[PDB]
Each structure stands twice: as structure tokens, then as C-alpha cells.
Design a protein around this ligand. Structure first.
Ligand SMILES: C[C@@]12CCC[C@H]1[C@@H]1CCc3cc(OS(N)(=O)=O)ccc3[C@H]1CC2
Ligand SMILES: [Zn+2]
Length: 258
């Protein structure tokens, strides 16, 4: 009886195995745009993905992860609210059963169709596993998806999903350029939080871009054909793999822009 997104093992149950679920810096949160304060001391984000080397795509039973070779200092996030350099390890999405829901963060309670997370680890901790044990170990860049025009840079991801339908399937996925998933603007909100799935570790500086990307209805429909289950198990569509907004508690959301 492992965690997931259903009635019996979903977000409202997670605290039993992972008590930090009710902790002081849980994610996601609602971003109240009027209360978020402009912080003129924040720097522009530096997203340097020119040398990013993707390796593989994996259905892990909750989402699909596009994994990167992080053995060298290549694809890095720095600047913004961050001290030091954070290395890209994977990206993944959260999405809905319908276009009206799917994002984890919300903006004045608005839910987007999906949300992309580019996960990076602080190089001062040497590797990913050690970084998640630290309060500044990860930086996750969050990008909202709305349904409209297709995102051409997403289609290579969409087309490989047929080959990783079920939990535990992976496929080679080289030479994928994550710069094709970014909006024009790097205006962002930032706050201290957590992983949004178990083990819910409070190790993340969240950087959430204001500008959504547009993807087509057909692109997101293909996300919804994936399966939570393994091959030869009852088919459970991989939809609504988002955690709802959590209490903000004693935190401030800062804006990079006026
Ligand atoms: C803690 C860990 C090692 C043991 C288990 C591992 C978890 C699994 C769940 C998870 C979900 C995420 O999604 S998100 N949405 O927070 O970016 C991002 C990262 C991890 C990793 C990080 C590394
Ligand atoms: Zn995520």
C-alpha cells in the first residue's frame, strides 16, 4: 500500500508515512500575486542549458522523468535567489484529467493545465542524494502550461511516451534540448519549500516563472494516456498527479519583477 494520487493513498494520506507533510515549508502553494513583494535585490535568473545532455526517459509510476547526465558541470541554474550553482538532473510534469486542473502551484487560485519542474542540485553538496538532505540542496524551476498553440520543443517528449506507457519502463532519450520548453520571460516568484511528492523533503528553493508556455490539446492528451500501473496490471490512467496547495505558514513569496 504505497503512496500515490488516489482516494486511498493520495495527498491527504501522505502524512502517515511522511509526517513532514504537515511541516513548516511544504509545497506547492498558492501564489497570491498582490501579496508577493517585489524584491529589487533579486538577480535575473541565469539558465545555462546550451550543453545539457539528456540520457533517458523513465515512467516512475507517478510521472515521467527526463534524466540528464550530471557528471560534469554543464546545464546549470544560478543567480536569481540562489547562492552558488545548481546542476540540472531531471525534469518532469504534473497534469490533470481535464484542462482545468493539473498544476501544483496556483496563481490567485488559478490552476493551469500542467506544470513543468526542472530539478537542479546544489553542487556544493557533491551529489543529488546528499543535496536533498540540506535546506538549500535543490532549486526547482517551475513553468506553467496552458492549452493553446503547440509547443514545438515539447513534441519529441510527447512522441516517446508510447514507449514508456507503464511504471518501470524507460527509453533512451538523448540530445533533447530543454531550452525549447522555456517561455520568453524569466520573471519569477520565489519561496522556500519542499518536494511535492513523498518523501516531501524541505530542501527546495522554488523559482516559479510568471509566463506560462502554451502546449496543444493534443500534446497534453498524450500525457493523459500514460499509466500509473505496471505492465500487466489493471490500467489506471496517469492523470491528476498534482499535490494541492499547502499552507504558506511563516513564509514570504518574493517577485523578481514590478
Ligand atoms: C529523495 C530522493 C532520493 C530518494 C527518493 C527521491 C525523491 C523521489 C521523489 C522526488 C520527487 C520530485 O518531484 S518535485 N515535484 O518535488 O520536483 C523531485 C525529486 C524527488 C526525489 C529526490 C531524491
Ligand atoms: Zn514536480
Amino acid at each position: 500500500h504505497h503512496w500515490g494520487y488516489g482516494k486511498h493513498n493520495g495527498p491527504e494520506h501522505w502524512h502517515k508515512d511522511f509526517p513532514i507533510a504537515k511541516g513548516e515549508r511544504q509545497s506547492p502553494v498558492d501564489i497570491d500575486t498582490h501579496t508577493a513583494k517585489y524584491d529589487p535585490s533579486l538577480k535575473p535568473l541565469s539558465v545555462s542549458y546550451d550543453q545539457a545532455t539528456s540520457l533517458r526517459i523513465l515512467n516512475n509510476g507517478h510521472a515521467f522523468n527526463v534524466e540528464f547526465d550530471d557528471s560534469q558541470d554543464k546545464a546549470v541554474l544560478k543567480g536569481g535567489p540562489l547562492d552558488g550553482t545548481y546542476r540540472l538532473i531531471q525534469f518532469h510534469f504534473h497534469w490533470g484529467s481535464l484542462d482545468g486542473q493539473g498544476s501544483e502551484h496556483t496563481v490567485d487560485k488559478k490552476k493551469y493545465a500542467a506544470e513543468l519542474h526542472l530539478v537542479h542540485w546544489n553542487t556544493k553538496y557533491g551529489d543529488f542524494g546528499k543535496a536533498v538532505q540540506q535546506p538549500d540542496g535543490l532549486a526547482v524551476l517551475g513553468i506553467f502550461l496552458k492549452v493553446g498553440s503547440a509547443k514545438p520543443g515539447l513534441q519529441k517528449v510527447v512522441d516517446v511516451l508510447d514507449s514508456i506507457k507503464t511504471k518501470g519502463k524507460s527509453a533512451d532519450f538523448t540530445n533533447f534540448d530543454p531550452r525549447g520548453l522555456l517561455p520568453e520571460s524569466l520573471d519569477y516568484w520565489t519561496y522556500p519549500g519542499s518536494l511535492t511528492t513523498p518523501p516531501l523533503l524541505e530542501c527546495v528553493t522554488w523559482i516559479v516563472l510568471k509566463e506560462p508556455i502554451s502546449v496543444s490539446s493534443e500534446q497534453v492528451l498524450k500525457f493523459r494516456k500514460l499509466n500509473f500501473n505496471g505492465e500487466g496490471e489493471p490500467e489506471e490512467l496517469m492523470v491528476d498527479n498534482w499535490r494541492p496547495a499547502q499552507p504558506l505558514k511563516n513564509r514570504q513569496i518574493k517577485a523578481s519583477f514590478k
